Design an enzyme around this catalytic site. Structure first.
Site, PDB file in Angstrom:
ATOM      1  CB  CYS A  96      -3.928 -87.021 -53.393  1.00 18.30           C
ATOM      2  SG  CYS A  96      -2.649 -87.916 -52.707  1.00 18.30           S
ATOM      3  CG  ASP A  99      -0.408 -85.727 -50.699  1.00 17.85           C
ATOM      4  OD1 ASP A  99       0.254 -86.456 -50.857  1.00 17.85           O
ATOM      5  OD2 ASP A  99      -0.763 -85.008 -51.973  1.00 17.85           O
ATOM      6  CB  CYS A 159      -1.678 -86.672 -56.752  1.00 17.67           C
ATOM      7  SG  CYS A 159      -0.023 -86.701 -55.954  1.00 17.67           S
TER       8      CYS A 159
END
Length: 208
Positions: A96, A99, A159
């Protein structure tokens, strides 16, 4: 936007199962080399018993494995996604948008990140180092956030709703059609980066 709820639920999601925070950074560093990571390799890196590594990984239900049962994805992954995370000459991927903003500080590298706007398909890219973002294209790039859920698959719950967008207005338009998402919020990629920095700070504290 005060981001404490997001920071709080993310830390909680990682501190829920004992050891997860302590396995995360070493595993991210290893995955960053761009090759699958065996449980046995990981156990040696952490100096843990195999059963301890296994229990934490079993709790991490979204973890990705290859044909040999090697770890190939946990936030950072070798398996293609919409979030391209390029370190050195090596094309990796992330689960995602957030991240991609978090990992470079944790692995001590600078990443060339690219994706597409989830609302318009427009290409987006930026350079993310441990301390800053640069070459933000387009400059107004935004990120969607949702609240992590307790008894929920992390990749499906968080995510897959945390995207890049070409701009905050574009993202807000998109957001208005998805108010069914828990704690849905739009922020600039700078604000998202800041969120990631607070998460990382707290994470490094909770480690042993």
């Amino acid at each position: 936007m005060k981001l404490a709820p997001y920071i709080l639920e993310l830390l909680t999601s990682v501190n829920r199962t004992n050891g997860t925070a302590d396995l995360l950074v070493p595993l991210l560093r290893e995955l960053a080399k761009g090759r699958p990571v065996s449980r046995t390799t990981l156990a040696g890196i952490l100096d843990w018993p195999a059963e301890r590594v296994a229990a934490v990984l079993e709790q991490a239900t979204s973890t990705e494995y290859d044909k040999d049962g090697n770890i190939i994805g946990y936030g950072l992954t070798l398996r293609e996604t919409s979030y391209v995370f390029e370190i050195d000459d090596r094309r990796l991927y992330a689960w995602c948008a957030l991240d991609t903003l978090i990992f470079p500080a944790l692995i001590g590298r600078t990443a060339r990140v690219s994706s597409h706007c989830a609302a318009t398909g427009a290409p987006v890219s930026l350079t993310v180092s441990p301390s800053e973002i640069q070459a933000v294209e387009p400059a107004g790039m935004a990120v969607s956030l949702v609240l992590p859920q307790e008894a929920a698959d992390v990749r499906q719950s968080f995510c897959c709703h945390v995207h890049f967008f070409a701009s905050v207005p574009t993202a807000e338009d998109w957001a208005s059609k998805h108010q069914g998402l828990e704690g849905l919020a739009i922020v600039s990629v700078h604000e998202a980066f800041g969120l990631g920095q607070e998460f990382n700070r707290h994470l490094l504290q909770t480690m042993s």
